Amino acid sequence: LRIIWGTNVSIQECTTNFRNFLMSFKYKFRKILDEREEFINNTTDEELYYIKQLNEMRELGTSNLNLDARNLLAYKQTEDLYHQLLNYPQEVISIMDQTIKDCMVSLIVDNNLDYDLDEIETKFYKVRPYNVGSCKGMRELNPNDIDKLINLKGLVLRSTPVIPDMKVAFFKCNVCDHTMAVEIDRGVIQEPARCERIDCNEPNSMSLIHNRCSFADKQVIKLQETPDFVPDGQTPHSISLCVYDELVDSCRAGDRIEVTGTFRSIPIRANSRQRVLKSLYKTYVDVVHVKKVSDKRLDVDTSTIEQELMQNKVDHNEVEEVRQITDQDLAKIREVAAREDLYSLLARSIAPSIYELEDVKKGILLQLFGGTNKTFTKGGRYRGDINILLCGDPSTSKSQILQYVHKITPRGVYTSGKGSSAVGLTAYITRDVDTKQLVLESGALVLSDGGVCCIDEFDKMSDSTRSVLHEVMEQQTISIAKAGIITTLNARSSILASANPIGSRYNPNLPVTENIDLPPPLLSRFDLVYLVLDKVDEKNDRELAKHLTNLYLEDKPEHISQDDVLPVEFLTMYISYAKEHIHPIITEAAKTELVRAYVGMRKKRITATTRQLESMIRLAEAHAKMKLKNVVELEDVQEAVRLIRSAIKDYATDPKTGKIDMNLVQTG
Amino acid sequence: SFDRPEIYSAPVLQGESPNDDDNTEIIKSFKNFILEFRLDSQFIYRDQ
Amino acid sequence: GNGLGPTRASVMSKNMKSLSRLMVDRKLGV
Amino acid sequence: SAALPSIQLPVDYNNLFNEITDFLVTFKQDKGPKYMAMLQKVANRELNSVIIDLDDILQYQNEKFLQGTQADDLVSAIQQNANHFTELFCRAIDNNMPLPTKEIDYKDDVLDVILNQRRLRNERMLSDRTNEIRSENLMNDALREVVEDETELFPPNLTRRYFLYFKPLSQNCAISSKPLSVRQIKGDFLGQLITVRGIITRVSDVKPAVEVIAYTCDQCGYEVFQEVNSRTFTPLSECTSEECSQNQTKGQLFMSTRASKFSAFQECKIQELSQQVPVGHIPRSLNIHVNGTLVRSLSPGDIVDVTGIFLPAPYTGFKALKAGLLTETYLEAQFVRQHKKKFASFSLTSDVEERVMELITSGDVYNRLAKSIAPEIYGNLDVKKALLLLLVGGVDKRVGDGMKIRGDINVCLMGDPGVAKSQLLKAICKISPRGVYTTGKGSSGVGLTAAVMKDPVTDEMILEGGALVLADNGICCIDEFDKMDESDRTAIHEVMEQQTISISKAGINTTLNARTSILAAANPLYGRYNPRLSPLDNINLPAALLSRFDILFLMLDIPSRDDDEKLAEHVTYVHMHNKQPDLDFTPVEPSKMREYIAYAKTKRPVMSEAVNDYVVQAYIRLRQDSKREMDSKFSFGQATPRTLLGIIRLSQALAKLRLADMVDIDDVEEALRLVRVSKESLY
Ligand SMILES: Nc1ncnc2c1ncn2[C@@H]1O[C@H](COP(=O)(O)OP(=O)(O)OP(O)(O)=S)[C@@H](O)[C@H]1O
Ligand SMILES: Nc1ncnc2c1ncn2[C@@H]1O[C@H](COP(=O)(O)OP(=O)(O)O)[C@@H](O)[C@H]1O
Ligand SMILES: [Mg+2]
Ligand SMILES: [Mg+2]
Ligand SMILES: [Zn+2]
Ligand SMILES: [Zn+2]
Structure with missing residues (x-):
């Protein structure tokens, strides 16, 4: 009973x-x-x-x-x-x-x-x-849902410093120095109105010793709702989560997390002087569980959270940052990596519902794998982030490829070019409504750290907004010196940009640089520049039309319209395992091939800067990381060179003048 | 232009142990004395 | 009833002891 | 007595309550009594809102009059003073509240089990008083009446799970329902149940507003409830129960959120319609207080008749400007009537069904619906067909990889001056339940985006959406499309492809959802079509903006003798009589068109192999024809994979208009025909 x-x-x-x-x-x-x-x-x-x-x-x-x-x-x-x-x-x-x-x-x-x-x-x-x-998002919860276990899903924007929540109040007698230790009870601590010692009964002798009390960790996290169902006409919502005593600092800004917690409501005092509460309660969430691993998403880059991982071990938070790979899963990963068609299998597994674009999906896969991160013992850092530009004729699925890499990446922000600003892409100063204070919030390039930032309409964004991307695409940092913030912020994010040429069509009369219309200093930063052209070929139309119309045969399509494609659940786990455990090392033959090829390309028309050698290396490393190889041979370098050449369509470009021979295009 | 908000209570649980000195315990014991006292098999105070 | 019992821990948490004050008969609710 | 004098009003509340009870128990004209059926549903917990129809009360009074009984005017009393009759009807329902036929199980709400627990607790305390007094040995009527004097029970407002609302009595079935403007609502109407006609401009988030805050005392074990009436309240510190008040060692009492009484609270803002504002005046707004289950029934942009109790609130302006007992006013909403029913709230009830069959059996649904779109506009039948397809829209496809296809048709009307492109835009706005009409280079720069502000009601930073956001799951009619800013054009590009707006600015990093169908109206380069110049040359749309539009009409005004004669007869007939000339063809009422389109949007036709093979062949032929003419003075921009998906979307929309589940060859034929005739005005 x-x-x-x-x-x-x-x-x-x-x-x-x-x-x-x-x-x-x-x-x-x-x-x-x-x-x-x-x-x-x-x-x-x-x-x-x-x-x-x-x-x-x-x-x-x-x-x-x-x-x-x-x-x-x-x-x-x-x-x-x-x-x-x-x-x-x-x-x-x-x-x-x-x-x-x-x-x-x-x-x-x-x-x-x-x-x-x-x-x-x-x-x-x-x-x-x-x-x-x-279900029910966050805004569809009624007051009858208060104190219920709810599940939110969203993006972490901000986190307050560790707030001390008093659990035990330590008082001390101003007369006899006798101390009791009161325990908190539902947020109220009973201050003693008399010394409990029988020797002295002074009424107001007891004073609270703030620094000798017992405190616990409390943290408030600002989250943006990304509900499965979004009612018409509403805008994205922000909520405050409360983590307690082991979950503090387990969520960093830019993290996509699914959080389970108690939907709570608290009365907020109208003024700091009097004790009067507002009749309209304020709602928040007491976090009881945080899930940072999605079965359809790449694992977070462990090279960026090593300090955070080992701080998580001291904190005994037991928050699963990276998914568990069982022995059977490891054996399956090795078996798939032992396949002869591994490269083409992984390439066509990337966005299975986009028509054949083998090099675009092969560059995307290499960017997802990334290069090798080399930290210098004497001071220095090389990051294997690969920046890819997709310049091309309109209607070529460039935006669907950015939308897949945004959904599949662990962290990253999808921007639209003209909707972005230089301050918006970096740290900015905002005002909190709870504390009424001025706080720092990260930008798109900072929230994308450790992931891929997708920038659509790269041509439409202005010159001054594009200035901040130079340091990110080269040093993978943002050195900000503004009023209130003077520091270097890690921005180790690959850049996946999409653009169409001037006139919204790739005019074959104009050279490549005229169509792309980007400054040499930014077009050099892109490791892979793809020219996606919409040629009129009858078989190409025949097959792109079957592909698109097959998606409409069944109301919700199950896409298996290929020889075989790995599920995103297996693909993400394979990519995460390769990123975490494989660190390719350049061999001497790879070095000679790299130098050979760089000198060959180093001989208007698009230039070939020293950055192209650094795109080769990392691209080769990416390939060496794809096959689970710990070393880079000359085959990987040859594949990187071939991908670089085919992305810009050098096979159809006259060496003297940068015209694309429309008849030489190999759509297929 | 609203009315006076009301305040009201209702017993739900056993609170802290009835203490003997509590005015409500004293009132209960006086009430029991009035209702239950017998003199020569007569509830003299109840009848009075 | 049967003659055996589950092995229960000895230390009772403060929250579990606090919940013992709020108990009411099942004639209310279920 | 000398102070607070008594007044003699013609309102007797005892017999009014008796009439309320009699109406609740006996009224059955709408198998048994309607309202006890509703209270039986409420008892079993299938319903949490009681809507008291004033038409039902008026009909009950009329029937009582017809049989000779003299009945007090309950309807007029409710209309004059509605706040007291919510209180009265709640007591009357509590008296006649049927016992539940369903037991409390684990799938019930926590509020339901709390109310059941306190009901059983108060009945048990009644029984305990009774047994104790019986044991004391000091008639059952007197025993009971002692028990309810010595019991502290949970009051009926704490054992109450339903919400009470007053539906106004219909104008045809007739004061509380005649629509009033915001200006027409003076202080004379204060305290009455009134209907205001307006447009909602701002809705706050549903927050828990405390009505009866509950506390628990660890000393006496009591639950002390304090009612909250104002914006702010002072929490209780020491217990006020019988035991602690009688004792000298008071108990300190803690809040119990789960035991407190909360209300879903929204503060909407209604605004005067343009037809209600006087000459030279700026429309003024009114505050609507939505409580209970009625929340989330009002959204910005809704044109609604809101019926509620006009009530005063304490003054909130500057204290130095207070001259007397000034009071703010709001409307405690009781009922909402939507002028344009949303497509999402469509239900196939009987009357909706009969109307749809009477539309279908008349035959020629496609042409009737197309020609009924702005019937005074004459001779734009392909235009009206494309607009109808835009209203219906295609079938949104989510591929398993997480990919999404738009499913919505964007239509661009580029034409000469005086061709009715702007009149067709407002026609579509009137038809669409969520339609936003904007003009480029006006004040829509922030409109085609959202602006971050502070909610005054709730201390939060919320970004209020603009044109592209308020017309979500609706239609944005953008006039003067060729005259927007670059940022607005990029936002339109993003909306037309991904149906989202990605903003990364100082203070905001969001991806707004804008599932908007764009209907653009544009003027050709130079404002008049030059047939000597190339079509793409005279189209000031980037090949990528033009590609996004599923259909692009070229509405050219070429002079003629018969065509101009026929337009002038039509326009002059429309000017004589405010209706279209044709007598054989009767236009569909826009409400009955919205109901058909709402029904059609519920269908999700799929494409078979036999239809998609032809779709592929037609796409191939279109691509070849586009290749053969790249600069032949008739080039419309070469066909793209986007034209295939536009063909597919038009075919799906045409299949939906047939209320079919199969995409048939006729629909693909008509889609190809529409795409082809989108461009034949050049010839
Ligand atoms: N190769 C393709 N594979 C799959 N779908 C495609 C392909 N090409 C076009 N489409 C479809 O046609 C539309 C065009 O693809 P988009 O992602 O809009 O192209 P885009 O390259 O982003 O266009 P711009 O350059 O931004 S105008 C989408 O709705 C796709 O579903
Ligand atoms: N085909 C037509 N049928 C009826 N009225 C028309 C027609 N074409 C133009 N008009 C009239 O022309 C006037 C101006 O049209 P409007 O829509 O403002 O022009 P535009 O769309 O070219 O900017 C309107 O009052 C409209 O009634
Ligand atoms: Mg795009
Ligand atoms: Mg116009
Ligand atoms: Zn002391
Ligand atoms: Zn008490």
């Missing part, structure tokens, strides 16, 4: 149901739940899932269990526990923490394990439900 007032939750029944779920859950239950019974493999989907998780947490010393809420729907006894957890997250999560402690104690005692029970008993175990029902 004895349910909790205001809730359906009964401590005994909920504890029993959650314990039964923990002891007797296998992932085949969820596979049956998701109507995926033919994916059920007896080897790993028939082991108790949470028993193994509890054992791993006991062995590793961690304290946080990541509970998939939908799993509770798979189990019959916890079909109601799912609704209880969603409706009453506080009570249910407290009961779940207690149940986790009991479960681990039972695992140690009942199996008679050697593990000490002292440090288990004194440890506080926490549960992190994440995969709760995903």
